[PDB]
Design a protein around this ligand. Structure first.
Ligand SMILES: *[C@@H]1O[C@H](CO)[C@@H](O[C@@H]2O[C@H](CO)[C@@H](O)[C@H](O)[C@H]2NC(C)=O)[C@H](O)[C@H]1NC(C)=O
Ligand SMILES: CC(C)CCC[C@@H](C)[C@H]1CC[C@H]2[C@@H]3CC=C4C[C@@H](O)CC[C@]4(C)[C@H]3CC[C@]12C
Ligand SMILES: *[C@@H]1O[C@H](CO)[C@@H](O)[C@H](O)[C@H]1NC(C)=O
Length: 225
């Protein structure tokens, strides 16, 4: 197994950071990050919890999930697949299979003056079926106390123009003011020049995420009506 990054490096803009380039194997997560990994990416919470992310990156992921939560929190299945898209990107011990760094710049530690490398942009090979299922679970979600669709607030365009791939492309575009750096998505259910797209299992909005989480309401999910 191999990573493309590990830990945070320099400022991108605002309070947002690039991650440090790293191409070695995943590393066991410190125990102080177990609460975060349980909360965000419980699918990875087993064995040595060897991941291609550190505690800082998990904390940053949690902070950055606030706006998706703002609009999608009422439909746990919809939010679940979205969290998984980000968990795999952030932490997967097999990152190198589906991520390709495309731009870097040097990072200089201000105290030791040791150089590291900011991952400035990367390409993310996302399963076509994954992306379609993620959109499918979210597409009827209503913005809280409204009759408009939640995706119209997370897609940089109205809901009637929002589609699976342009949604993911928008969320991954730092021009949105939220993403710290741009990720360019490539959608395929098939390998691409030896890259194996991320095609994790997904949950529909009519399914329970787990034993303690109900399916989404009829208002947010026309299947359950
Ligand atoms: C994406 O899917 C992979 C493959 O199913 C998940 O990895 C498994 O997770 C379960 C639950 O902890 C473990 O029992 C297995 O040992 C894992 N399998 C392998 C082959 O790694 C992974 O959890 C999913 N990703 C996320 C973020 O949930
Ligand atoms: C404007 C709206 C639609 C944006 C909604 C999606 C936001 C929350 C997404 C887009 C890109 C995402 C980021 C992608 C990459 C990383 C690097 C990782 O090591 C820490 C988490 C972090 C920083 C993610 C947090 C969630 C994120 C900021
Ligand atoms: C998702 O796809 C199913 C069929 O797989 C369909 O019934 C439903 O209308 C779609 N949308 C939602 C919100 O689940």
């Amino acid at each position: 197994q191999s990573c493309v990054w590990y830990g945070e490096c320099g400022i991108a803009y605002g309070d947002k950071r690039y991650n440090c380039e790293y191409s070695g194997p995943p590393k066991p997560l410190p125990k102080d990050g177990y609460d975060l990994v349980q909360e965000l990416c419980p699918g990875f919470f087993f064995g040595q919890v060897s991941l291609c992310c550190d505690v800082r990156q998990l904390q940053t992921l949690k902070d950055n999930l606030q706006l998706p939560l703002q609009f999608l929190s009422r439909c746990p299945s919809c939010f679940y697949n979205l969290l998984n898209l980000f968990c795999e990107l952030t932490c997967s011990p097999r990152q190198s299979q589906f991520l390709q760094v495309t731009a870097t710049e040097d990072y200089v530690d201000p105290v030791t003056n040791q150089t590291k490398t900011n991952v400035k942009e990367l390409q993310y090979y996302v399963g076509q079926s994954f992306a379609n299922a993620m959109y499918n679970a979210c597409r009827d979600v209503e913005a809280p106390s409204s009759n408009d669709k939640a995706l119209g607030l997370l897609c940089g365009k109205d809901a009637d123009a929002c589609q699976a791939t342009n949604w993911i492309e928008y969320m991954f575009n730092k021009d949105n003011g939220q993403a710290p750096f741009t990720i360019t998505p490539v959608f395929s259910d098939f390998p691409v020049h030896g890259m194996e797209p991320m095609n994790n299992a997904t949950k529909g909005c009519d399914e329970s995420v787990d034993e303690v989480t109900a399916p989404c309401s009829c208002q947010d999910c026309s299947i359950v009506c």
